[PDB]
Point group: D3
Chain length 307, copies 6
């Protein structure tokens, strides 16, 4: 008995996933009270069932997170069998340590503790900001890479001796993995000091593919593209998995030298961003549906990591 439930964060992605599983979303009233508190009621029998909840903890982050945890509590008190939280974008993942013992929280651990406390039995995410967040849980956590879809899109561009560039130092590992997958090309690294951007590697007369896990504001992405074009690069493409696009992202991307921005659909796009002519979206519904299928049928999940 596989049952799918959705929040208000990613309803269209949940509908696409349900379509690919040839089922329909479970019936649950999830809204707000008059004063703004989350209201949840499960409107069908879930006793002993195998429940999947699809919801990203994207902006508005706190409302979406409260929605998810309140759904889990409601399902657990209604005697559900197993609850899997499908969280395509995991919010608060960038607050994952205390640098220099700064008096800051580790909020990703706080969220993992909340999810474990309400009774989640498994978590399925896409491209966690830090892979070590798998260890913040006691339950199995499956971190699925979005790189197959993005690489499939890259290979249909016919790039001229492309080079893979990471816009910052934190993305070097991911950029190297993408480069090894992309016909084993070269990689370059953007190094930022003091306000100048230093490029390590040769980009003269080559197509540049900027790869990142997310695009939050686009300031550093636009600056990296500007530096790459100033050092003589033909075309610049930006590939990311999570389209956060917060703050002044639309204006930054509009007045930029990037030829194409390609993102996945873990977060719904705004009308502001969708109006842009050079922003393209790929879908992860098939990959997530296959992962849900394998989890539900007790099959091996390692098959999801092939290109």
């Amino acid at each position: 008995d596989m049952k799918l439930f959705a929040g208000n964060a990613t309803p269209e992605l949940a509908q696409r996933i349900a379509n690919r599983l040839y089922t329909s979303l479970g019936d649950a009233a999830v809204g707000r009270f008059s004063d703004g508190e989350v209201s949840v009621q499960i409107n069908e029998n879930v006793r002993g069932g195998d429940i999947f909840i699809i919801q990203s903890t994207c902006a508005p982050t706190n409302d979406n997170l409260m929605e998810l945890v309140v759904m889990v509590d409601a399902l657990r008190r209604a005697s559900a069998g197993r609850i899997t939280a499908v969280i395509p974008y995991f919010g608060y993942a960038r607050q994952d340590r205390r640098v220099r013992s700064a008096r800051v929280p580790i909020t990703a651990k706080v969220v993992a503790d909340f999810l474990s406390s309400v009774g989640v039995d498994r978590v399925l995410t896409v491209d966690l900001h830090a892979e070590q967040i798998q260890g913040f849980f006691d339950v199995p956590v499956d971190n699925v890479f979005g790189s197959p879809i993005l690489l499939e899109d890259m290979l249909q561009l016919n790039l001229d001796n492309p080079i893979v560039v990471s816009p910052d130092i934190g993305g070097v590992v991911r950029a190297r993995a993408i480069a090894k997958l992309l016909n084993d090309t070269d990689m370059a690294i953007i190094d930022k000091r003091r306000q100048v951007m230093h490029i390590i590697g040769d980009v003269a007369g080559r197509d540049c593919v900027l790869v990142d896990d997310m695009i939050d504001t686009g300031g550093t992405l636009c600056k990296a593209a500007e530096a790459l074009k100033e050092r003589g690069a033909k075309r610049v493409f930006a590939y990311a998995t999570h389209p956060i696009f917060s703050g002044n992202a639309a204006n930054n991307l509009r007045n930029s030298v990037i030829d194409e921005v390609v993102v996945c659909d873990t977060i719904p796009l705004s009308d502001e961003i969708k109006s842009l002519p050079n922003v393209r979206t790929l879908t992860l519904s098939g990959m997530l549906a296959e992962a849900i299928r394998r989890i539900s049928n007790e099959e091996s999940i390692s098959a999801m990591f092939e290109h």
Copy 2:
């Protein structure tokens, strides 16, 4: 070493409490990141200290709650000694059971579990919606009544043989307590059936004092006042502790037959409500400051329940 910290929910109440304790609020940067996630940094040494956090979980409820739990986590990882959460208004307290085994959450228990998980050592609240929420925690919970302040204000009205009325059946116990405190007057009960309001008790030619724990939308309060005046009551006064005032509350209170609405300051008022000429606010800063003083000095807290 008593240190006070405040969130963004009730900063002026926290400042008043700090003034009455002859100290100043601790220095902590509490704001938002670009995408809307809560940002917290404690900017002073708190090692081994006795920390009090003042913040209501009022609207926007989820942001305020996340702010509180993230502050507690940051303080606990910074080696604070004891953390007391002063929550003048406790949000989600109305979701306290599952009626008829409805597939709903018990969200007050979820919030209590979150607070216990991040490391709170004591909770101090004002007029919990259900007193049994004290049992949702393992830590001491002090539920302080706001009835001394409201009764002091009532006794300066010179009411003509007043009668204490509860606007619904859930408030009968509180209304009876207020009536016994108010020179041992009579009490009447509003009974609602089907859309008509039935009044049990005699209100003909008497001043009526409606007492409630909160005013959320004011619809039932205005209806009760209308019924009381239709059964021949001279003047109607509304007394409450928590001024939620959500939805259409301002228009409901403007076009109403209530002579005076008196509330406490557990939730800041909007400009919409503050423009109203017949809404008056009492302060709880002295009572909360005395409670904090007694907790900090290891004195008996039972002295707080005298009129």
Copy 3:
């Protein structure tokens, strides 16, 4: 594999429930050692089974509670699958908060913690004193109302314009629910001050039905009946779910003006009470058997709340 086990608190109710499920009680030796400590031995295979334990925590309360928790521990170490505690009367439910921060325990929370610690997976009760005790547990708790049986008995009395009266202020909500179920009649409230009883509502020349969750000593019930008859009421009937009947209850009920006392069978009656001519018992075995049937077969439990 549904297996029923019984303690020494309510053996005849357990036998009736087993009869209605067309099974027999499981074989377990549950007694005392020489010095009075509880002795338990499960005398059949329970590995992987779906176990229901039927036992009220009624007087002697502590022995019955220890019996229940020791049974649960014995079954859990014998590799039982799922353990449901059917507790028709939940003892210690009246100690559910600390009024005015009195240095008292919250013993209902203590008992819930004990039950959760030994390994109970679900609780099924009848008419909890406070519904918020559902939140004292992490496991599902089904609070089943006894009002269908009592209302069925009420409707066979042919009352003359009956009015529903709550003997105290704590029972107003339940009395209102019963009144709305009883052809939508009126309700009156007994208000006690200082030693006099004040009645809010008109009872002149009407049949009065006193409704309560329990009858502990009968002092307040007899006083309320006396006041109702003094204000000119034709007949007084007392309806309750839990027949505790402690202290001087038999003498109070014998020298009283109540025409009929009707109770359920969550607690066995003594010979003292059974000798009384105007005390009648209704059975809850059918309702509890249906609830157990629905829990065992993973059906919806919401069907149990219809009249």
Copy 4:
């Protein structure tokens, strides 16, 4: 701030301990409600204090145990600093394993879990039935031997080449320890087969000292004394720490060949037993008072194990 509290199990022992500490027992109302549920109220400030609760879990075992756990919960919610449970006799200690995987509970572990759940910080006991019960807790457990007092009494008897006998096989280790302390005498062992008692060791023409941790019914003790006298022993003395004396113990001890029965005061004696002419009581109040003194002042507890 050392505060002593007592239950209703061992009030005179608690008073003696308080006398030896030159303090007085703390003021707390500990009784029963009308229906038999435990009632507790702490009538003094205990905030931040160092609390000791003196109560044996002796017969009636379940009432005493519930009294203790309810006291601990009340003190913990009243913000006590540290709670030490002084349990001179630990009930349910004989149910400490499952022999041959019998479907029985391990009730000593259940009681340890209850005590840990309510918030006990340290346990102090006398002559635990199994020393491994120390490992049933997470908190420090100090198991103090009563053998110094009993050995002091033995050495004032002027025994004629005494031999130390264990009435069963479970007491051989304790009997050997006593024998090594008693001028390094010999030891004999009572072996019971099938209904006959086999004695291993020579007892012809010697004084026999039977040593045990407890005397529950006295049947095996009287049988062992009978066998020892039949194999030609001059005088038989019985020494034990815990005087349970359940069932037919008084008649067994009256019609027995034992010259003297000496016990400690961990359990109050009945009038039935106190009427016996050959039963003598030693006091442990000094030893327990010294242990409490050392725990309170953060001194080494190893000094308590010298003769």
Copy 5:
């Protein structure tokens, strides 16, 4: 789906058990990294399976224990259904209490806590040093006696009026059980004082069977055999379950008066010990295989305790 996995501690015993279950060991790479840290990889699907891990925590104890806990963590994160730890010899079982409140650990409790923390669901052991270690866990623990195999071997020796001797005082209970099983013979006890060995019981002209749970160094066993032969015993046989054989055990057994040493196979023997001509090994693979079979099929485990 029963799956067997083995560590590096007892691979041949695991292979024998797998042979008797007519299955094969599961495929898992369990070794060491370059620096000596344990490396584990499960090389087959275990989702929802019923997993048994066979590994003794014998010398090198800490490596074997870490191997076991790391395997359990790997299997739990791979979504295994139920994990049973089959630990034929349980290391650290001799550190089971704090005698005289010595500042020592209770390491058996530490190991039980580690096993419970990684997610073990059941433990199956052979001849625990202290049976109360069953209470150190929350999960079912089945302590299976090795006495059937040893008694079967004893009865094929044709002993001349044998007497069962325990080499120390801690083994008296086990020696008595063996004696009652061995045609209800007599038992004698070795008592050690100061450096001399005192024998309680008559051994003149009888065959002596020394029975113990383990043989660690053999010093006390050889001394007991020497004393027994000095008091005129014909032949001395040593029977034990766990062949630890540490330190100078081989030289002690070589220069000893023991005619035969018979042990089980819970710990692999060294070449040093296997070279000895009078050391014989019995197998427990059949008994453990039957226990695993009964656990897997949800049958009663009490059938394992018959001779």
Copy 6:
């Protein structure tokens, strides 16, 4: 009351730290039993004290880890006040996630859970392999960088326009931090594909400083030095914090082109490595002593992160 205790892993480092704190190491017997199990006895009063345990979990890793956890359990049962584990090198830190959902453990989380279970209150480490391991704990974890000491040593070399090189992609962040501290020089990255080493950045005619967190076998370090010298680098220096030096490290470093290897003293060096002429050791005893001093006196720990 600050008390220092040491294991057998890093006794000389512990002695140096004790010397810099002008105290002496606490008296505790920490060794092995005959069969190889860890033996611990605390030989002084620690009641209420502030205890620091200094021990790296270096090779033999499992013995050292068991030593640490057993010490913590012994101290916690002896009523210690606060226990801080000073672990200069944290073993198992490289097993921090499951790549591609490989059926592997997260052993760093297992070790963190063990430490939290025995009762550690704070952890102090040096240069954790992954900083996110701070989130594997609930307690404060202070990750102190060793870069001040190494940078002080670097600045006394008089390098000719040095360039900072990371031997692999996982060390790029640390290499960049070191480069920014080292007069804001340039950085180069070693990229390994397929067996060839690709260098991103210009190293022609410059001094190269290889920086890493650890040196396990030295194979990749020697290969990186060889590649750097083949692309025309004057001198190559290797700087690391943790000198693991496992496997064939001594032969790799002997037959290498590295001019100097400088490491800290978190792990004792072998005689094999100490015989090498171009391996130099720096001490961290002063920095760790200052950190312990600040923790003990409740001072801010942020002062430890300045150069």
